[PDB]
Structure 1
Amino acid sequence: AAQTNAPWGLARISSTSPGTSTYYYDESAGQGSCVYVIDTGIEASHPEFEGRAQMVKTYYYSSRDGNGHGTHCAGTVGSRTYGVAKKTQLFGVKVLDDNGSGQYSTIIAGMDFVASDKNNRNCPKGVVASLSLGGGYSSSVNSAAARLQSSGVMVAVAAGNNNADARNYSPASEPSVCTVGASDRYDRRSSFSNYGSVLDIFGPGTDILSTWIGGSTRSISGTSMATPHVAGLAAYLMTLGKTTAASACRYIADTANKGDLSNIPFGTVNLLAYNNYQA
């Protein structure tokens, strides 16, 4: 399949080179996979989700995404137009309030929730969790992310937007998950992207168009936007049978575009998520 005039990030993860405009992908499109978006929620009614999104848990008064961020991230995972894995199932877990903030105890609970809830879902191609969030280092946050990964979920987390070493942020600094830095359309590390040895992969993160609340769309930037590209790619590769939840991060790093990015500090991987699709 080929989506013409795709968002740059989708084009980029199906190209060896920057500057293309078509997103090339196997039509399986993540069918049979599931991705939990652990964030401010998902506006499941957005037409772009085609009925494939649902809220499954909230830690606040409502399950509504009153912010947008979670809807955006979900759209990069699996919306029709803006998503990597256009046929995946999306599950929303609202751990962040409508200002985009959340307490670590709540975030931890949301991870534990996914680890359990997945056992109640029919996700034959496997389960991914996308965590476009983080704060300062916390061993308990990292441990929760590690547990979620261990439970059989491919966990992708944002590196953080501090232009600093991700070792000081969580869950970015948890080694066992897939920690995702952000790039821009010119293959530069995004100006705000964290870096460091703990990064596994980069994905598109600057000026990413996706769904927004109110049935809208908008472009925003962040490692929060890079993370769902990776989560969606994992879902897509799992549906293809190329990898598993346990191995997807490594597979993605293995099969990434290597050495394409600029302003990568020495000791940070130079790896950009790539689907390797061949028609």
Structure 2
Amino acid sequence: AAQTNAPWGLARISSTSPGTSTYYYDESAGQGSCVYVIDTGIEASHPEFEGRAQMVKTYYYSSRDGNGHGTHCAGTVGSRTYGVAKKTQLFGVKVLDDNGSGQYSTIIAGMDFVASDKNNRNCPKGVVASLSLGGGYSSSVNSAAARLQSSGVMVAVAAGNNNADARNYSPASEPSVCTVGASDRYDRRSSFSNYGSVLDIFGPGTSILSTWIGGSTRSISGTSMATPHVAGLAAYLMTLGKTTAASACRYIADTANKGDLSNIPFGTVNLLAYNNYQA
């Protein structure tokens, strides 16, 4: 399948080169795989989710997405226009309030919710979680991402937008989960992108067009938008039976566009997410 005039990120994860704008993908498109978007929530009712999105959990008065952050990450995962896995099921888990922030105890409770909630969902192709959130190191938050991963969910986490080593951030610093750095359309490390030995992969991060609240669209930049690209890819690759929840991050890194990114700190992997799809 070929989506002409796609966002630059989708086009890049189906490309050996930068500078193309056609997303190529197997028409299976992650069907029968679930991606949990742990975030501000999702506006499930966006015409771009075609009813494949629903809120399954909140730790606030409303499960709505008043923020947009989580509606925009869900979108990069499995929206029809701006998604990687255009047929995946999206489960919104609102750990972040509409200001975009949350307590670490609530985020932990959300990760543990998914590790269990998956046993209440039809995900025959497997389960993915996209954590586009982060803060300082916390062995407690790391251990929650570890558990979620260990429960048989491919965990993709932002490195963090601090332009520092991700070793000092959670759940970015957790060795067992997929830590995603950000790249821009010219294959440069996004100026904001965290780096280090803990990083496993890069996704498109800078100027990422996706879904927004009010049934709208807008472009926003972060490791937070790299993550849903990787999250999406893992969903896609799992539905193709090309990898599993446990070994997805490794598989993505084995099959990645190597050496293609500039301004990658020595000792950080030079690996851009690649679907490796041949039309």
Shorter-chain TM-score above 0.5? yes
How far apart, CA to CA, are the structure 1 residues paired with 2:242 and 2:123? 16
Deviation, 1:49, is 0.1
Residue 152 of structure 2 aligns with which residue? 152
How far apart, CA to CA, are the structure 2 residues paired with 1:233 and 1:102? 27
Deviation, 1:54, is 0.2
How far apart, CA to CA, are the structure 1 residues paired with 2:59 and 2:135? 18
How far apart, CA to CA, are the structure 2 residues paired with 1:205 and 1:265? 17
Residue 86 of structure 2 aligns with which residue? 86
1:21-32 matched pairs, under 5 angstroms? 21-32=21-32
Structure 2: give runs of 5+ residues left out of the alignment.
none
How many aligned residue pairs are there? 279
Structure 1: give runs of 5+ residues left out of the alignment.
none
* Superimposed CA distance per residue, residues 177-224 of structure 1 (whole angstroms, 9 cap, x where no aligned partner): 000000000000000000000000000000000000000000000000
Match of 2:235, SS state, is helix
How far apart, CA to CA, are the structure 2 residues paired with 1:59 and 1:197? 33
How far apart, CA to CA, are the structure 1 residues paired with 2:243 and 2:101? 33
Deviation, 1:2, is 0.2
Displacement over 2 Å in runs of 4+: none
How far apart, CA to CA, are the structure 1 residues paired with 2:57 and 2:25? 31
How far apart, CA to CA, are the structure 2 residues paired with 1:210 and 1:106? 26
Match of 1:49, SS state, is coil
- Tell me the TM-score normalized by structure 1: 1.00
How far apart, CA to CA, are the structure 1 residues paired with 2:106 and 2:161? 21
How well do the aligned residues superpose, as a CA RMSD in angstroms? 0.3
Match of 1:154, SS state, is strand
Deviation, 1:126, is 0.1
Deviation, 1:258, is 0.3
Deviation, 1:95, is 0.2
Residue 98 of structure 2 aligns with which residue? 98
Match of 2:48, SS state, is helix
1:1-279 matched pairs, under 5 angstroms? 1-279=1-279
How far apart, CA to CA, are the structure 2 residues paired with 1:263 and 1:106? 36
How far apart, CA to CA, are the structure 2 residues paired with 1:11 and 1:111? 30
Deviation, 1:18, is 0.3
How far apart, CA to CA, are the structure 2 residues paired with 1:205 and 1:15? 16
Deviation, 1:140, is 0.2
Calculate percent identity across the aligned residue pairs. Answer: 100
Deviation, 1:6, is 0.3
How far apart, CA to CA, are the structure 2 residues paired with 1:214 and 1:168? 36
How far apart, CA to CA, are the structure 1 residues paired with 2:143 and 2:149? 10
Deviation, 1:21, is 0.6
* Superimposed CA distance per residue, residues 126-169 of structure 1 (whole angstroms, 9 cap, x where no aligned partner): 00000000100000000000000000000000000000000000
How far apart, CA to CA, are the structure 1 residues paired with 2:72 and 2:104? 22
How far apart, CA to CA, are the structure 1 residues paired with 2:202 and 2:153? 20
Deviation, 1:37, is 0.1
Deviation, 1:253, is 0.1
How far apart, CA to CA, are the structure 2 residues paired with 1:2 and 1:88? 17
* Superimposed CA distance per residue, residues 73-118 of structure 1 (whole angstroms, 9 cap, x where no aligned partner): 0000000000000000000000000010011000000000000000
How far apart, CA to CA, are the structure 2 residues paired with 1:144 and 1:264? 29
